[PDB]
Structures are given as C-alpha cells and as structure tokens.
Ligand binder design. Structure first.
Ligand SMILES: O=c1ccn([C@@H]2O[C@H](COP(=O)(O)OP(=O)(O)O)[C@@H](O)[C@H]2O)c(=O)[nH]1
Ligand SMILES: O=c1ccn([C@@H]2O[C@H](COP(=O)(O)OP(=O)(O)O)[C@@H](O)[C@H]2O)c(=O)[nH]1
Lengths: 334, 337
C-alpha cells in the first residue's frame, strides 16, 4: 500500500484566519475532488496524508496541520511518503522532495500548470487547452456516493432547476436563468454572488424565474442536489478563453440522482452527455426545444449508475494509483 | 513604419453589453498598458489598429471586433505587419496572413497559451511563467501626458492611497495595516468584489480606511497625484488562478510615479524590480512597527524624483521602441520560447 500526501489548495475562509476544510463547508470544487479522492484512496487501503487543509477521524487518514505553503513544503521535505499528489496548482512542486518520492498533480485550472511534468487533467479538452502532451493521463473528477444522497435517502424530486457554483459569467448563471425560463421552471441560484452588476442583470432579466439563495453548504447542499429536477452547468467561452476543466457539480448532481443540462464548454462536452444533454451557448433558448431537452434527460437511477460507472470514487482512485506506480517505476511525461 | 494590430483583453462592462474601452472607464490595467503603448507607437509614427475594445476614443483605428470570434475573423484578413496580443491568448498565431508577425505581452501570473513570441513585464513573471532567457522583458509603459504633470500643481494631501481590486493577493488589508502604522488614512480606491475580506479590513482598520469604491477619469488622476504615497502591497498568497500569487507588472506603480507620487510596496514578483526605483519595498503581512513605517514614509523620494524615474524607465516612447525593435526582429524571422 502507498503512503500518499494529498496537497489540497491552501485557502483561508474569507474574512477569517480559519482554513477552508476538506471537504469544504461551502463553495469549493477542488476541496471536493480531494475528499472523494481520499475516500477512494482509503477504501483501497492506502495511507493518506491531507495537506493544505488544516478538518475532519477515519482510519488511514492523517490531517497534517500544514496549510501555509511554506509549512507544506517544509513538511514535504522530510515526509516519509511515496506520492506527493498536488491539487493546489503548484503551490508546491517536485524540487526538495526526498529521493524516490513520486510527484503527481491533478490540474484543476483553465491556465497551463506550474508543474507540467507528471500532470493529469480532468478532460481531454483541458489537457489540449493547457498544452498537455498526448501521453499525459486524463482522469475525470471522482465521486463518492456516500458523500451524497442515495436512493435509500428518500429525497423526493421537485420542480426547480438548480445552479450550483459561483454566480459568474464563465459559470453561465444568466444562461441557466435563460434555460429555466424557457422551460417555464424556477431556477434556484445557489452560489456565492460577488459580482453585483452581473447578479443584478440576472434578476433584472429573469427575476421571476430565479430564486437567489446565496452560497450553500452541508445538508441543504445535498438536499438541493438530490431534489432538483435538473442541474444546469452552463459555462461559457468568455474571457483565457474560459474552458471548463472538470466540472465538479456534474458528478455531484449525477451521483445525487440528478441529470444535467450543460454546454459543450471544455470538459462539459465530454461528460455531460453521459448524464444529460449539451445545449448551445447564449440565452436564446426556444421554449419547446428546451422543455423537450428537459424531457429526454435520464432518470435518477440511470445518472446515478453512470456517475459511479464512470467517475466512482474507488474506480477513479484506482486509476490514480496506477499512475502513482508508473511514476514510482520511473515513468514520466510530459 | 508599421501597422500594428493591438489586441486588448476583450471584456464587457459588468452587467452591460457594451465593451470596456481603452483606456478603461474605470478599473483595468491591461487596458491602460495598451492605451499607454498605443500612444508610444502612435508617436513613433506607426499605425495602430485596436481590437478587443470596440467603442474606445478614436493614426489610430479602433476596430468594431470585441468578441474573440469577431477579432480572429478580422485578423485572418487584415493587412498588418504585426499582431500584438495583450489578451492572454484569446487569439493566436494560427490563421494570420503569411508574413504577419506574432507577439504577445504577457499580463498574467500563469503560463501563456502562446509562449512563442511572448514578452513579460518582469523577470519574476518570466521565470515564474517558465519563460526562456531569450524572451524579452519589457515593463509597463507610462505616458506622462495621460496623468498629472508638475505644471498641473496638484496640491499634495496627507493620505495614503490604494488603487486596485480589494482582493487578498493585492494586499488591501496589509496596506490598511501599513497606513494605520503610519497613523495616516488609507484612501481605499477600487472594486470591493469580496465582502468578507473587505468586511475584514473595515473591522480591523475602520478608523484608518476610507473606502471610495471604483474610480476613473479626473478623480482617478487627482488621487494618483495628491496622495502622499501609493500602496502596492501584493501578497505571496495562494489563489483561484492556481499557484502562489506573483505580481507580473503592477501597473499602478508607473502611474503613481509619473504622477509625482512615491510608492510603498512589497517584494512580490515584479514589485521587487520596480518599487525601489520609485519608493520602498517592505515585508509581507500586517506587522508594521509604527515608527519604522513612519521612517519608511518620510524617507520616500519627492515628486520630481519619481516622475523623472518613471519616464526614464517606463516612458511610453522608450518602451514602445523596445517593442518595435522586437516587431522587426520577428518580421526578420527571429523566434523565441
Ligand atoms: O453555494 C454553493 C455553490 C457551489 N458549491 C460547490 O462548489 C463546487 C463548484 O466547483 P466547480 O468545479 O463545479 O465550479 P468552479 O469551482 O470551477 O467554479 C461544487 O462542489 C459545488 O457543490 C457549494 O458548496 N455551495
Ligand atoms: O478604482 C480603481 C482601481 C484601479 N484602477 C486601475 O486598475 C489598474 C490596476 O491594475 P494592476 O496591474 O495594478 O492590478 P491588477 O490588474 O493585477 O488587478 C490600474 O490601471 C489602476 O490605475 C482604476 O482605474 N480605478
């Protein structure tokens, strides 16, 4: 079995000197990746060391009290692990690691990575857009069904469409509102709204469709993912040009028995069709084609099974351990 | 002489359909770099075609292509010698007519889409973006004619000035901490898009900071000119861009300096390279000893000193000319990174 350090993106609760946790109390895509990843890792019986997230006891899991990047680099210089798995985007790197420690990253950004050697990408669209070479492995966002509402949880479906993410132009909140209005359905707008003008223009334009609820967390987040009719993942090629790297909410919605309407943006082209349908860019959604797009979305059972088949936390973590071992074997790229 | 197509970063005005101009109506430093460069280029006798900024004040030609598709269609048919990208690779070399040269100014913390024919505003940026030793470094240009002069005789005021996004990596908090140490006021000019951080500042340093929100036009210019110093306190903090923050070119420094205002900054990325020309580099974080920051503040150079400094190092003409040099190199068949 491996000892594997998971370097989470080091990040402070806004306003606080407290840390954002893995998993996160609210908004936080990468911290969710690490959490369904570490769960998988541990189920495979690997030893996990959680860094950049000083956070929640389970066997095999060590939460290192290191969050400051220099606290991490220091801890990592003397750490007795086999695999440094960076999820932070290069807050730390390969140099200064003890000899025979393998370096690996999962790339979660639209920009080219600090550390392209031993880098992995959420999608082929991402790899391409970041300049990743052909032998660079593409490994999707993983999802632990245990973190999310199951069929056994008995959460009933309701009428609304759901947006969960930052209320920002590249996330397509306005386009979500335009789709939901085209279907004659409410959009619950769950997410941090930090850009006032764009928020106000959403409500000015689709005020009667959208219900803004702010950033959400814990039980509410899971109940919302579980109950929504569809989750809207409508990222837009705006200024990068925005290419969605891995689209965290697509595995969450699907694993919560919720199908997805998204765009073909970056990674959405590759994953959305497995659990829903891809629509075009913009806000010009003809109503009946839209309601028609809604009514050919799979059922809770089929998306919940596609999620696990394709992105299951154990399956995906096994795809990573095979890389860790290529690395430790003397394998490299790119 | 040359016709240079200059690609601004195409961005809509928030909540509107209209475009952010060059120079920008408010906040935006790529849009100023471009404005300041265009000035230089226009002065040196070249023809400029401004893309990525339809609707801007119009030998300049402002092209009505703002959308990247709109821009790249125009580029595919234009008769220009040089395409100069400032957008971070919203467009690229492929599909330009044969013998059009490609060059970018890299304005970002992250590695560029178009590493070939890329230039960086600072050596920290180039190092940090993985740019080769052959990739020109050419800092932010400043056109003095865009700012207050000595002749303008703007009366200096007591206050310290922050001018940027009130975000953590820009160190608004730390600037408030530095102003409080000096016993001065911090005029906090800029977009506060992040409530809790901004609430964090006002909580710790409420009698120190005067938040005014975003500014432009004549208020902006006067503020740059009347401030006792400008605060450029970027922090080596982790971010949404991914990685540690590393200030690539720090446009506000050149602005301050050419306005007769000295700068107190950190050593973050480019700052280390430009701030000691026009003021003092200080430590990261909020722990400033009063008397020592007070020292730092009274030891800063005078208006005349920094203005001579800005022009000398970052003069729009002198900086546009180092670009042209790079344009001709490319058209002559040179390459790099
Ligand atoms: O109010 C919210 C909005 C979003 N999220 C979470 O934030 C992540 C969104 O990350 P994603 O990669 O989909 O969007 P991005 O982080 O790229 O903007 C997902 O885990 C969401 O469940 C949340 O917890 N509360
Ligand atoms: O209220 C404001 C705040 C900032 N700025 C301008 O915003 C740009 C800040 O760019 P800088 O490179 O210093 O910081 P960054 O672009 O990385 O946020 C500069 O031109 C400032 O003069 C402005 O015009 N009004």
């Amino acid at each position: 079995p491996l000892k594997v350090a998971l370097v989470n993106i080091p990040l402070r609760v806004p306003g606080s000197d407290a840390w954002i946790s893995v998993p996160p109390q609210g908004y936080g895509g990468i911290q969710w990746v690490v959490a369904n990843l570490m769960d998988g890792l541990l189920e495979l019986g690997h030893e996990v060391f959680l860094l950049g997230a000083p956070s929640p006891g389970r066997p095999g899991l060590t939460v290192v009290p290191a969050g400051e990047p220099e606290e991490i680099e220091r801890w990592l210089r003397t750490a007795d692990v086999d695999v440094v798995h960076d999820h932070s985007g290069g807050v730390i790197g390969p140099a200064g690691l003890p000899p025979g420690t393998a370096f690996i990253s999962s790339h979660h950004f639209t920009t080219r990575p600090v550390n392209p050697v031993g880098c992995t990408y959420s999608s082929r669209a991402q790899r391409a857009h970041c300049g990743g070479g052909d032998d660079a492995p593409v490994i999707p966002i993983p999802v632990d069904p245990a973190r999310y509402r199951s069929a056994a949880d008995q959460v009933a479906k309701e009428d609304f469409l759901l947006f969960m993410g930052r209320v920002s132009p590249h996330k397509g909140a306005l386009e979500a509102a335009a789709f939901a209005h085209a279907c004659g359905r409410r959009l619950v707008l769950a997410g941090p709204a930090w850009e006032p003008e764009y928020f106000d223009e959403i409500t000015r334009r689709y005020g009667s469709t959208v219900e803004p609820i702010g950033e959400v967390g814990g039980e509410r987040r899971l109940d919302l993912l579980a109950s929504a009719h569809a989750v809207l993942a409508m990222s837009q090629a705006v200024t990068g040009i925005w290419c969605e790297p891995g689209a965290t909410v697509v595995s969450e919605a699907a694993v919560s028995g919720t199908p997805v309407v998204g765009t073909g943006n970056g990674c959405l082209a590759e994953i959305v069709p497995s659990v829903g349908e891809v629509v075009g860019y913009g806000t010009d959604f003809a109503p009946d084609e839209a309601r028609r797009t809604l009514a050919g979305l799979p059922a809770s059972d089929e998306v919940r099974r596609a999620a696990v088949r394709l992105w299951g936390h154990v399956t995906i973590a096994e795809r990573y351990v095979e890389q860790y071992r290529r690395l430790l074997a003397g394998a490299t790229w790119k």
